[PDB]
Structure formats: structure tokens, C-alpha cells
Amino acid sequence: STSQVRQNYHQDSEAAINRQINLELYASYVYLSMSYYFDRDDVALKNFAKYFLHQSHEEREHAEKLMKLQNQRGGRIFLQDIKKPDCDDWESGLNAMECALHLEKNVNQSLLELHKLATDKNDPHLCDFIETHYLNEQVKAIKELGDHVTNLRKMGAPESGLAEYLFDKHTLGG
Amino acid sequence: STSQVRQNYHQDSEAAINRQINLELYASYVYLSMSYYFDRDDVALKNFAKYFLHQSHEEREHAEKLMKLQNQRGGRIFLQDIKKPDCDDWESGLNAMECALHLEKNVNQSLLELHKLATDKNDPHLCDFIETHYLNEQVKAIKELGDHVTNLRKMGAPESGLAEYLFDKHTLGG
Amino acid sequence: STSQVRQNYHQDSEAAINRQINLELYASYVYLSMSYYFDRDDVALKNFAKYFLHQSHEEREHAEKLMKLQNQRGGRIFLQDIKKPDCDDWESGLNAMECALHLEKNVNQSLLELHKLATDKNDPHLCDFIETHYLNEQVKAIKELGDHVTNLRKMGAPESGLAEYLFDKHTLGG
Amino acid sequence: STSQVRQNYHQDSEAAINRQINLELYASYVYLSMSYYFDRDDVALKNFAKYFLHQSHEEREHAEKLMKLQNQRGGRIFLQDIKKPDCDDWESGLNAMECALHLEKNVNQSLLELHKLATDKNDPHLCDFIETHYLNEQVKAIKELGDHVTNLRKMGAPESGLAEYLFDKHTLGG
Amino acid sequence: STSQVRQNYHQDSEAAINRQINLELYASYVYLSMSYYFDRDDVALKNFAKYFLHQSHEEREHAEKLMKLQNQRGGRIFLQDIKKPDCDDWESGLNAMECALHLEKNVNQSLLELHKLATDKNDPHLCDFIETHYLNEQVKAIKELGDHVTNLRKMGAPESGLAEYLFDKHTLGG
Amino acid sequence: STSQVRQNYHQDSEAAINRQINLELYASYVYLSMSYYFDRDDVALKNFAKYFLHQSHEEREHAEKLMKLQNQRGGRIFLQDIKKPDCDDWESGLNAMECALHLEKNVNQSLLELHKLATDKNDPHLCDFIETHYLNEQVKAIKELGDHVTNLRKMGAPESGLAEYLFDKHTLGG
Ligand SMILES: [Au+]
Ligand SMILES: [Au+]
Ligand SMILES: [Au+]
Ligand SMILES: [Au+]
Ligand SMILES: [Au+]
Ligand SMILES: [Au+]
Ligand SMILES: [Au+]
Ligand SMILES: [Au+]
Ligand SMILES: [Au+]
Ligand SMILES: [Au+]
Ligand SMILES: [Au+]
Ligand SMILES: [Au+]
Ligand SMILES: [Au+]
Ligand SMILES: [Au+]
Ligand SMILES: [Au+]
Ligand SMILES: [Au+]
Ligand SMILES: [Au+]
Ligand SMILES: [Au+]
Ligand SMILES: [Au+]
Ligand SMILES: [Au+]
Ligand SMILES: [Au+]
Ligand SMILES: [Au+]
Ligand SMILES: [Au+]
Ligand SMILES: [Au+]
Ligand SMILES: [Au+]
Ligand SMILES: [Au+]
Ligand SMILES: [Au+]
Ligand SMILES: [Au+]
Ligand SMILES: [Au+]
Ligand SMILES: [Au+]
Ligand SMILES: [Cl-]
Ligand SMILES: [Cl-]
Ligand SMILES: [Cl-]
Ligand SMILES: [Cl-]
Ligand SMILES: [Cl-]
Ligand SMILES: [Cl-]
Ligand SMILES: [Cl-]
Ligand SMILES: [Cl-]
Ligand SMILES: [Cl-]
Ligand SMILES: [Cl-]
Ligand SMILES: [Cl-]
Ligand SMILES: [Cl-]
Ligand SMILES: [Cl-]
Ligand SMILES: [Cl-]
Ligand SMILES: [Cl-]
Ligand SMILES: [Cl-]
Ligand SMILES: [Cl-]
Ligand SMILES: [Cl-]
Ligand SMILES: [Cl-]
Ligand SMILES: [Cl-]
Ligand SMILES: [Cl-]
Ligand SMILES: [Cl-]
Ligand SMILES: [Cl-]
Ligand SMILES: [Cl-]
Ligand SMILES: [Cl-]
Ligand SMILES: [Cl-]
Ligand SMILES: [Cl-]
Ligand SMILES: [Cl-]
Ligand SMILES: [Cl-]
Ligand SMILES: [Cl-]
Ligand SMILES: [Cl-]
Ligand SMILES: [Cl-]
Ligand SMILES: [Fe+3]
Numbered sequence A, B, C, D, E, F: 001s002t003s004q005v006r007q008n009y010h011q012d013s014e015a016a017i018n019r020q021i022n023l024e025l026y027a028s029y030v031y032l033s034m035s036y037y038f039d040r041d042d043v044a045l046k047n048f049a050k051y052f053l054h055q056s057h058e059e060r061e062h063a064e065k066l067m068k069l070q071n072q073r074g075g076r077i078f079l080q081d082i083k084k085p086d087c088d089d090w091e092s093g094l095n096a097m098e099c100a101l102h103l104e105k106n107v108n109q110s111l112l113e114l115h116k117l118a119t120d121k122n123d124p125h126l127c128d129f130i131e132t133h134y135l136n137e138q139v140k141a142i143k144e145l146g147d148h149v150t151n152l153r154k155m156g157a158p159e160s161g162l163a164e165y166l167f168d169k170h171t172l173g174g
């Protein structure tokens, strides 16, 4: 039976929102894994660890907002397994930042495909939701990660452990 | 090569900590799923939703503390997929509370098996970690969920939607 | 029928908790009796009276925490008569302090037997409960009472009513 | 030998005060038992539990004031065993309230018999003590418990677990 | 003659506590020596000096708590010479941090042997004392020192005097 | 090779400063031992214990200032074992105060010999250091301990446990 609230909400959009919820939860899990890598005693970069833990908690918030959207529009949430991150060892601060850049660009591509679907189904509320809450967040995240990668490369990372140490203090510390 | 920090930390304990990290992340995901079920427009119990979202965020903290422990002791974190919850539809406030009770007792049983292992490997630091940060938390969680189940049953849930409405306001609201 | 909360809680542990509840209530009653002895007009040591009344109220709190534990774990409270203290006349400040020392060491021995049982039944939550809330409390109580007995003996109690008077002011007063 | 303070204090009054001390301690123990019944996971009415625990602590204060009176008048305190409550399972909020009503009327009858004795022995200080500190307290307690019993009966207790739940929140909660 | 407070306290446990007191005083002396090495005009790392002086004062507190425990349990303190540190010249910030790591792991091993003894003598109060006040302190200390060693190695210490200078400012300074 | 800072600092003065550092650490250890003697349950004079613990921590500060002096002048610290106190049992408050008096006069004699050496080597900076930071401290310490010994003797210590009790409260308490 049709939800009493549902209006102009295509079944393909509903399914795509469920896919996006899984992707945001996956991103949360990737950042959680990265964070505790930097907490290892043989890595020991505490501001890298705090930066990625914050990004993990952000992504959980991104997922919860999409779950709230699904219910606002009268769709039904269907959850899937959250796959483990492809990587147990992230190697260095520079490599983790490059992996985060690549993650945040795949999430953006998924959101752009979701916006194209919403446009094709003439769902301006969903278009505005994506634009307002997700697309500029992603552009800002990608720009920040690019900036971080550039600085770590210019400073001599990953071979310079002094580069990663000083970036941890001065950019992330900090 | 052996971590420079590692002392009295058995390889079986290290593996069991990695298993427990996955279980805590799984519990976080179960509570996330339960929370947004109560946010559906055709369920609409906002204090059930907030209660379970808080429990989800707690469990993420439980996982992060175990990741920090692994690194404190010189073990190595190895992550696995976070399985989706077995349930997409949690049916009622009473049923979700019963499922949470059953989840929090399985997590407790895993922690008791972890404590038995730590005891068998003569690891008093790990025993104290489990006792201090996990075992009484679990006893309190189980007692609270039992209390909630009892009240919902006595009030007439799940058949009485008025019971679940009033429990949402007065116990969870609240 | 089994409590919906009960997990890893042996029936022998449940019975031993009920025994301990009675012992804590008994200790509360002993200290109540001691307190009002020092309120008699022919004893008249008001800080001895306040010290023992505080210890009485503490013990009631110890009993209530064990009652809460019984319910947290899904056991059932069964109460017994609270026996009157073996003594109506406590004779002196020194003698009451010696009787309190002997009481607080019997309570400790009961708690150590309860911990041995919890250990034998592989109940780490109950072990941690006893260690966290009871065993160091008892060690501190026993040490304080020993200290008090020593000072009263060194000052010349019980034969010196001036010793007990001055201890009442300066140590208990006070 | 006669206390240096004793004046106009009959030996029968002294004995009756000792009886009343035991009764007040018994009442304290009854309310303690009732309180933790409502803390069970299969009863779970936390404001019933707090209400009865407060009444328990009140009664201990009633006992201590009578112990102080005994010494003020030059009598000698003699303590007896505190009998366990006649009931381990109090069945419901309504039944516990009825049992408390019956307890508070038996305590009142004992205090009225104590006042008749004080009157017959021409002890106006003891009459005034009873009137000032005990008799209106009892009338207020009995009226409050009657009010509570009436409301629980009108709301449909004990068969309505919703009645007891809502009384717990709104009258005792509360 | 037996202390009036002593209960369930084995003579082997008493002796082991005296050994541990000496070890904690020794650790205090090692850190004192390390601190003033970094105060030399030809070493001149003032935050290394302050870090180790703080660790020295901590260890004195660890010793004093064990002396208080000995008396709480009715044992008798017997002191031994505090041996001088094996090292007059600690060579570098990295080497001192490695020596501190090795010291804090030997202290941990002594505390684990003390806990095994307490367990074998069925002394749950002493087990809880060790777990509560010592074992997690040690795990945290060892993890922090491991982290410090890792960062100094990654930054290029000891050959890079710039590495030790910058670690002194940014991690210890500071 | 000669320290770049060293000027007018004789090698005999450098060695004598190292001897004095050991003596101050020894004094710290003596007072630590005395403090915990008064913490025993069969001694139980808590203000004697706090007085001596404070004196212990003072002496550690005296040692650290001499270590800083050694480095200020370009000398090299060389540490020796800290001998255990000659006494495990200090017998009484009066005896401990007499032992402290004798300790503080031996430390003074060592400082006067150090000043004679500095004078003979025409080292006015070292003379002024000793005069400014040590010699009047010692005169004050010796005068205070003499005062304490006198009062304890006049009050009837050590045979009067009441004397030591009251001195603990009124002079040290206090
Ligand atoms: Au990778
Ligand atoms: Au990978
Ligand atoms: Au990657
Ligand atoms: Au990557
Ligand atoms: Au659109
Ligand atoms: Au289910
Ligand atoms: Au299911
Ligand atoms: Au379930
Ligand atoms: Au379920
Ligand atoms: Au263990
Ligand atoms: Au007795
Ligand atoms: Au007796
Ligand atoms: Au006794
Ligand atoms: Au006794
Ligand atoms: Au256990
Ligand atoms: Au009954
Ligand atoms: Au009954
Ligand atoms: Au009844
Ligand atoms: Au009744
Ligand atoms: Au009267
Ligand atoms: Au060395
Ligand atoms: Au060496
Ligand atoms: Au070393
Ligand atoms: Au070393
Ligand atoms: Au133990
Ligand atoms: Au001596
Ligand atoms: Au001696
Ligand atoms: Au001496
Ligand atoms: Au001496
Ligand atoms: Au001079
Ligand atoms: Cl639609
Ligand atoms: Cl559709
Ligand atoms: Cl799946
Ligand atoms: Cl990857
Ligand atoms: Cl922007
Ligand atoms: Cl190991
Ligand atoms: Cl191993
Ligand atoms: Cl996997
Ligand atoms: Cl399920
Ligand atoms: Cl608790
Ligand atoms: Cl069970
Ligand atoms: Cl069983
Ligand atoms: Cl009985
Ligand atoms: Cl007795
Ligand atoms: Cl303590
Ligand atoms: Cl009379
Ligand atoms: Cl009479
Ligand atoms: Cl009796
Ligand atoms: Cl009854
Ligand atoms: Cl009134
Ligand atoms: Cl209502
Ligand atoms: Cl013993
Ligand atoms: Cl023994
Ligand atoms: Cl020695
Ligand atoms: Cl060394
Ligand atoms: Cl921690
Ligand atoms: Cl020179
Ligand atoms: Cl020279
Ligand atoms: Cl030496
Ligand atoms: Cl000596
Ligand atoms: Cl002066
Ligand atoms: Cl005085
Ligand atoms: Fe996201």
C-alpha cells in the first residue's frame, strides 16, 4: 500500500537513496579504519587520527540525513551489509589522504548520478536536497583533501617522517 | 617484527580484540537501522528514534576504545566487513527493544569469552580493561532494556499503539 | 520462568547476593545501635554518635546497591529477618571501635567468599561489581578503624574518659 | 542506679519507647523491601521504588528520634531483632500501597497506645513529644496512602499495567 | 604479634609489596637522572627535562600509595637502598625515551607477577588495587613512550638534533 | 673537552656538588620512610605522616636545584646509589623528630664544608648559591625541629601516647 505522504517520488529514486545510504555508511567505516591506523604505536600521528575520526562521524551524519529523507518522502529504508574498507594498512599520512580524496570523489560521482536521476524524474525537492546538503559539501571536502595532498607532497612525504610529523602539528593540530 | 611496546599480549588476545571491534561496529549498525525505522512516517516515534541513535553512537565509541587498546598493547587492527542487520523492519517499539536486549546479551557473552581468554593467558591489564570499560556497561544496558520491555508489555504493546506512544513520551522523552 | 535479562548468573551467586544483602542490613543495624549508645546522657560523646550513625546510613546504601544488582542480573530478592546486634551496651568508645573493626572484617570475609564463588562460576561482571563497589571500601574502612583503635589505646582509653573526650573532639569532631 | 537526668519517666513508658523503636525499624525494613521489588526488571516502576525508599529512610529517622528521646529522659535503649517483612513479593503497585496503608495504621495504633500510657502516667513531656513529632505525621501518611490507593483503583490497577505506569509517572514522578 | 587489621593478607604478598615499593622508588630515581641530563648546557632540551621530572614525581606517588596499602592491610614496610640508575649519560632524547620504555615494561612485568601472586593467594582486594591503580597506568605509559619513540625515529633522531629540538617543542612543549 | 659555559668552576667543587646531590636524595628517602611509618595502622599519626612527606618532597627540590646548578656552571652530573635509611622502625614521634634533627645538622655540616671549599677556590657565585638557597633553610629547619623535640619532651613523649596525639593535632595539624 502507498505511503499516505508519498508524492512525486519515483521508485527508482527511492532505490538510489538506499544505495547512497550504504555508500555514506561505507565512507564512515573507511574513515574509522584510517583514524585508528594513525593511533597505532608504530604510526603515532594523533592529529591525523582525530581528523579522520571526525570525518567518520560526519559521514554517519550524512547517512542519517538520507534515512530521514527516505522517510520524509514516504520511501522505505532497506539496509545492506557495510563492506569492510579495501585496506587494513594505509601506509602513510600522504597515502591515507590520497585514499580519502579518491573516496570523496567516488561519493561525489554517486551523488551526481543521483541528481541526474532526480532531474530525469522531475523531482525538484530531491534535486534541492542533494544540492543543499551534499554537493557543496563534497566540493569543499575534495578541495581540502587536494590541498592536504599537495602540502604533504611538497614537504617530502611519505619518505620524510619529519614532513608528516610537522603537517600533523601545524595543519591538522592540530 | 615485534612491536617495541608489546608485552604479555598473546596473539589469541589480539585476534579476539579484532573480533570484538567488528561486533561493536555491527551493534552500532543495528541500532542505526532501528533508529531510522522509528523515523518512518508510518511508525513516527521520535523518542524511540533518538534513543536508538544514541545507542548507535555509544557503540561506535565502544569500537574506537578497543581500536585504541589494540594499538596501546602493540597489536595490529584488522577490520572485516560490517554485516547488515538481520532485519529491515523492526515491527514495533516492543520488538525493537526485545531485539536490542538480545543484541546486548550476545555482546556480553562475547566480552565474557574475551575475559576468559585474557584470564587463561594471564593478562591482568586486559582483564581490568574489559571489567572497567565494558562489563558493567553491559549489565546496565541489559537491565535498562529489560525494564523497557517489561513496561511495554505491561502497558499492552505492541497491539496498543497508545502504549507505545505514551512510553515514547514519558520513558524515552522523552 | 527465566527472567528475560538473566545471562551467566548462577543460582548459587543469586543466593549468595541475598545473603550479603542481609549482612549489610545487619551491619547497618549494629552501627545504629552503637550510635545511640553514645547519645545516652551517661555516655555523651556526640561525635562518636554521629560517626556511627553515618556508618549505619552507608551500610543501608551498600544493601540497596546489592538489591539493585540482584534485579539488574535477573535474580530475585528474598529478604530475611535483620537480627538485633549481639550487644545492647557497647561499654566505651574503644570497645565500640573494636567491635566495628571486627564487624567490618567479617563483612570483608563474606565479600571475599562471594568473589571466590563468582570466580568459580566464571561471572566477571559480578567479580568486577564486588571489586569496584565493595572490596576497597572495606580495606579503607578496616584501616580507618584500626587507626582509631590504635589512637584510643595510645591515649589511655577506656579507663581515661579524658582520652575518649579528646578523641571525640579532635579525630571524630569532630 | 538512677540516671542523674531521669524525672517523671515511668519504667513502663521507657519499655514502651523501646517497643516503638523496634516498630519504626521494622517499618523502615518493610519499605526497603517494597522499594527494591519495584526495581526488579520484571516490575520496573522506578518512581514507586524511589517513593518507598524515601519512606524507608524517613522511618529510620523516626527510630533515631525515639532513641534520642530515650536518652534525653534517662531511660536505656534495648534493641531487639528487626523481623523481616512478612512478604517477599508485593505483587503490584496497588497491593504495595495497600500494605503500606495497613503498616502506617498499625504504627499509628501503637503510637496511640503509647500516648494513652503517657497520659495514664501523667507524663506531659512524652505526650507532647508524641503529638508534635509522630501523630500528625501519621495522619498525613495515612491520608496520602489512602489517596494513592483510591487513584490506583479508579485507574484500573492492578490488572491495568498502563494504570500503574501512568501513576508512577504522574503522581510519584514522579 | 598480628596486626589488629590484618585479614586475608599473605606474608608473601606483604614481601612482594615491599619489593614493588623499592622498584617504584628506583623508577623515580631513573627519571630524576634523565630529567637533569636534558638540563645540561650541552644537551639543553628543557621540555624533555620537564617531561622526565614529572614522570619522576609520578613514580614517587606510586611508591607512597603502595606504602599506604601496606599499612592499610596490616603489613610492615621494610625499605631497601634505592640503587643508582645504571646510566649517568642518556646520550639523546631518543635513547632516554627507549630506556624509559624498557623501564616502564619491567615495572609492568613486576606488577603482573604481583597480580599473579595475589590471585594465587586468593586476595581479591589486592588484585583490585593493582588493576585499579597500576595496570592501566602502565599500559598508558608504555603506549605513550612507544608513540614518542616512533615519532623521534621517523623524524631522524638521534643524528638529527633538529628532530629532537622540534619534538621537544611540539610534542613535549611543550 | 671543556664545557663552553664553564668559568671559575673547580673540579673539586664539581665533585662536591655531586656528593651533595646524593645527600639531598638520601635525605628525601629518609623523610619518605619516616612519613609512611606514621601511616601504619599501629602508629596512626596522620599529621606526622604529612609533615615528613612534605619534608621528603622539599629535599627532592633541593637535589634538583643542585643538578640545575651543576649544569649552569658546566659541570657534569654523576649519580650514585641512594642508600636506604639506616632505620625501618622510627619508634615514636619524638624519636623521628630527633632523627630528623640529626639528619638536618649532618646536611648542614656538608653544606658548610661545601662553602669552605668554594671559598678556598675563590668561587663567589657558588658561595652565594649556597648562602642564598641552602644555609638559612637549614638554620630554619634545625630550629623548627629543635622546637618540636622540646615540645614533645615537655609534653611527656614518647611514653605518653596522648602527648604525641595532641602534638599531631595542634602543632602539625595540623
Ligand atoms: Au590501499
Ligand atoms: Au588496499
Ligand atoms: Au585506498
Ligand atoms: Au589510495
Ligand atoms: Au530536479
Ligand atoms: Au527481526
Ligand atoms: Au529479521
Ligand atoms: Au532481532
Ligand atoms: Au528480536
Ligand atoms: Au586476568
Ligand atoms: Au559486646
Ligand atoms: Au555482647
Ligand atoms: Au561486638
Ligand atoms: Au567487640
Ligand atoms: Au570473575
Ligand atoms: Au503480602
Ligand atoms: Au505476605
Ligand atoms: Au502486607
Ligand atoms: Au497488604
Ligand atoms: Au500527658
Ligand atoms: Au644506558
Ligand atoms: Au648504561
Ligand atoms: Au637504559
Ligand atoms: Au636504554
Ligand atoms: Au585476586
Ligand atoms: Au634509628
Ligand atoms: Au636504626
Ligand atoms: Au636516626
Ligand atoms: Au635518631
Ligand atoms: Au666565595
Ligand atoms: Cl509518488
Ligand atoms: Cl514510481
Ligand atoms: Cl547485504
Ligand atoms: Cl583502499
Ligand atoms: Cl563554499
Ligand atoms: Cl607479548
Ligand atoms: Cl603469543
Ligand atoms: Cl570481511
Ligand atoms: Cl534481527
Ligand atoms: Cl551500576
Ligand atoms: Cl543464567
Ligand atoms: Cl544456575
Ligand atoms: Cl528470617
Ligand atoms: Cl557484639
Ligand atoms: Cl584507596
Ligand atoms: Cl522517674
Ligand atoms: Cl517507674
Ligand atoms: Cl530479639
Ligand atoms: Cl505483608
Ligand atoms: Cl497537616
Ligand atoms: Cl499521559
Ligand atoms: Cl592474614
Ligand atoms: Cl601468611
Ligand atoms: Cl639494602
Ligand atoms: Cl640504563
Ligand atoms: Cl585508557
Ligand atoms: Cl673552570
Ligand atoms: Cl679545576
Ligand atoms: Cl653507587
Ligand atoms: Cl637512623
Ligand atoms: Cl629567617
Ligand atoms: Cl586539647
Ligand atoms: Fe558523505
Ligand SMILES: [Fe+3]
Residues within 6 Å of the ligand: B024, B027, B059, B062, B107
Ligand atoms: Fe558495545
Ligand SMILES: [Fe+3]
Residues within 6 Å of the ligand: C024, C027, C059, C062, C107
Ligand atoms: Fe557494608
Ligand SMILES: [Fe+3]
Residues within 6 Å of the ligand: D024, D027, D059, D062, D107
Ligand atoms: Fe514511623
Ligand SMILES: [Fe+3]
Residues within 6 Å of the ligand: E024, E027, E059, E062, E107
Ligand atoms: Fe610506577
Ligand SMILES: [Fe+3]
Residues within 6 Å of the ligand: F024, F027, F059, F062, F107
Ligand atoms: Fe636538603
Ligand SMILES: [Mg+2]
Residues within 6 Å of the ligand: A001, A002, A003, A004, B042
Ligand atoms: Mg498508509
Ligand SMILES: [Mg+2]
Residues within 6 Å of the ligand: A018, A019, A020, A022, A023
Ligand atoms: Mg551503494
Ligand SMILES: [Mg+2]
Residues within 6 Å of the ligand: A039, A046
Ligand atoms: Mg593515541
Ligand SMILES: [Mg+2]
Residues within 6 Å of the ligand: A055, A058, A141
Ligand atoms: Mg568529509
Ligand SMILES: [Mg+2]
Residues within 6 Å of the ligand: A081, B083
Ligand atoms: Mg549477507
Ligand SMILES: [Mg+2]
Residues within 6 Å of the ligand: A127
Ligand atoms: Mg537544479
Ligand SMILES: [Mg+2]
Residues within 6 Å of the ligand: A127, A128, A131, A132
Ligand atoms: Mg541547489
Ligand SMILES: [Mg+2]
Residues within 6 Å of the ligand: A131, A132, A133, A136
Ligand atoms: Mg550549499
Ligand SMILES: [Mg+2]
Residues within 6 Å of the ligand: A042, B001, B002, B003, B004
Ligand atoms: Mg618496531
Ligand SMILES: [Mg+2]
Residues within 6 Å of the ligand: B018, B019, B020, B022, B023
Ligand atoms: Mg566478531
Ligand SMILES: [Mg+2]
Residues within 6 Å of the ligand: B039, B046
Ligand atoms: Mg522524524
